[PDB]
């Protein structure tokens, strides 16, 4: 029961006549649903993932400049020009300067000057356009059949949800089945966002914010960088030669600005899905079709032993592993009570009807004790297993 | 001489100690200088000019759009681009079209679309640098030697000026010489300006106005038209479809906007030279080296004949033309008075000492009469020419 | 002289005789000094510099982590040491982690984790301490030498001006001599402050702000980096694992903080020199040992010609250039007046007594006309090279 493994867990109880019970699932949390005569069920959101985005824009975050060129003319010998102004891959600026005879000039006054440089991206952030139909929600489920730890990763059923897969049927061998309906149409707001990627790291960000970055960018299809001056400073002109400098690598500033956004991992092993951190989804469980497998079986009227002692969990419930011997397929009785007279059970089980199907079975049990001192009890007759507990 | 012809005229009268006399010459006007025992001098500003100024800019005012191309992308497939977008002689615009199944995209929404057009200029205005140092100007001058209107064009003295040689000298044959110190063409409007040329006409305009024209322009050295979006227009998008047009030829709007400027002319017959209008020049004339040619000669004594009657100039002088046919080179006496009987002269002889230069000769004479009724007289004796006149 | 060739200039007036004159030399400006008989004087800084200062620190701005490993212990079993945790070359963090049967561990609770990584600096600032004792200065001086601007580069008085070397004398010919005392040990405010170097660019800033940089740093050449956790992120532990990453290149963020600092240039050739910007000096200058030259040579009357007509410096004063062809040694006169009568000079002749030496060259002349209407006048015969001026 993998919710036992999860640090943050919520129990949910169905009304005796209810049919659907609903819960919110979010990645680091887990939920256990319980109903009065049916095996309890763990549910959790494993990942929200998205397949095959397409690039909208590349944004350059460190420019490098080459082949600087300059031209200048004297204060009344007409406007300066440079052939580089014609070329889209040249960043460029025009301005006046003071000029005087010592420059190789002919007059005193406001000369006219141009400089350009070949602009090239070294590294760039990629903004991906987000496919609002290819989102997938991945839910894990399992029943409290009471299987030992090492079996859990094989006994979970993995349900993948999307707008087509609007309801899913979870089948549990010999325990019947559950049906599950999660609200994918309204779980998240991706339509206003991009997946922003930097090398081996990524975020999901608002389209408006990204388009308002003060930073030079290019179409995903390729083209020409088209706000180049945002990364070039022209040092105001010394009258013989202006000079131009790259504004330096922005990486750390940029990813400082992203700190508010939700983290995303590109999974290089799982095809090329982008996996969101910290998404959530709302969902209904339908419980009618589950049944308590072993209800038929006789009580286990014979010796037992703990494979692991009853042990605390942060959830405020004890967990134990019990094994039988000389036993048929049979029902393990369990109670929690004030003293070994055991007149009134006060504990409420999570593993609703503990069973062994074969004498070599190794059975996990989880139970919520009342507050205060109490004795946990397993089995019946003078062979009772018993264990003291406090709160 | 030609101050007779020029409609707007000033008289300058030198006090005896004024070896120099100041004058202001204004481009349409004429000045007559008079001094007590010295021949009077007409003087006149003929031209103000710039030789071969440099082109600052060309401004396009009629554009046409040879090629057009469009690229478009569906609402979740990223930004469009074009190869032309990289190439400097293409105007371009970025927008989103609406898109949907009716136009081949898989999703309803707004799709990126970009269009570009190859721009070219049909006609452009040229702007030129006004070097305040290079302003040439030309002065006309004549003594009142009293020659026929037919002879002024031969007898005219022309004085050229530059920022160099502000002193200039006019000799007059048998009359001596005078010298002009001309201060610069005072040019009070011509700083911070361009000469604007547009086909067969031109204007001088301030730099700020010109640079603030909402029109595409390039350097005089040639290059790339820097603000093409003033003259291309893009219709709002339709699916996968932009219509682009030039704005109409702007010539008329530009001519009308320029109407307040001082107009400029090109001396197209002679030179690559631009001739201004509305100049002012201040000069001073040294008079002392002028002399009167015939003061030694005998008084002309035989009968004379009017080639032209006395007539009003409209300047309030009267002008006359007189023929002699007897007697060697001699002084022709002229006076104007009230009495027909022997009378003291009242008027000022603008032509101060009229003379015959040959036995059969024709002479022009100009006089400022007194106010009121009078008789004007030429010749000494019995057969005086005499003429009725008033104010 | 060359203080003409600079946008900002100032004019200081001394007094007759022995007096020292106060001056200032902020590194961009060039300043003019004059006195009622001594010629005018032009001075500027070349540079303020340090040679081979001492490293205070290196500060890393881009770390990379090359080995990572981890140790983890079940909750009751007590804290994890890890062998490299004492190795100064490794960054480390120690934190508890949640553990339980989903993690191969005996009891549910807070396990312990330690994780460490081998830190390496990839790129870093170098910081150099400076002491006023090591400040070099270099200064330019000129008066009215009459050298070609083509040769100022070799005429120019090149005062190397290290505070641990003797005061220096203006070694001019024919103008007497001058000397300078210039607060050389004490003009600056660079205390408690030091040079920061990036790749091929550099800045000067206070040691306090540098100490307050939240970045890992190293004192000596080699030795342990002091605060590596400022560039290592440890993602919160999960199960038996932690993931650690470099915080990414800070270069751009760091440079963004430096924009208000005064700039520095490490030299291109004497590669251990650092040339400071924004320095300044204040001086007193010994004018009284200077002389005019040719003070009683004849007032010239030769026929005389401009080579450059009166040009506004922008300093509120005029420059011009004049040539002559026979008065080769003679005193070229100039004055300024209300009228060409020139009864009195009314302006300040910033070259007070110009010196001719060749027929080949133009002489280089400056003048300051009074506010309002006036005539500038070169020569004083009828060879009046005269020009109207205004405020």
Numbering used by the authors:
A (entry chain B), B (entry chain C), C (entry chain A): 1 to 391
Describing publication, verbatim:
Yellow fever virus (YFV) is a re-emerging flavivirus that causes severe hepatic disease and mortality in humans. Crystallographic studies have resolved the structure of the YFV E protein and shown that its domain architecture is similar to related flaviviruses, with three N-terminal ectodomains, known as domains I (DI), II (DII) and III (DIII) and a stem anchor region known as the transmembrane domain (TM). Here we use a chimeric virus platform to resolve the first high resolution cryo-EM structures of YFV. Stark differences in particle morphology and homogeneity are observed between vaccine and virulent strains of YFV, and these are found to have significant implications on antibody recognition and neutralisation.
Given that DIII of 17D was critical in improving the particle homogeneity of bYFVES504, we next examined whether swapping DIII between bYFV17D and bYFVAsibi would have a similar effect. Remarkably, the bYFV17D/DIIIAsibi particles most closely resembled the phenotype of the virulent bYFVs, whilst the bYFVAsibi/DIII17D particles most closely resembled the phenotype of bYFV17D. We then resolved the 3D structure of bYFVAsibi/DIII17D to a resolution of 5.5 Å. Furthermore, incorporation of YFV17D DIII into bYFVAsibi also switched virion homogeneity and FLE mAb neutralisation sensitivity phenotypes.
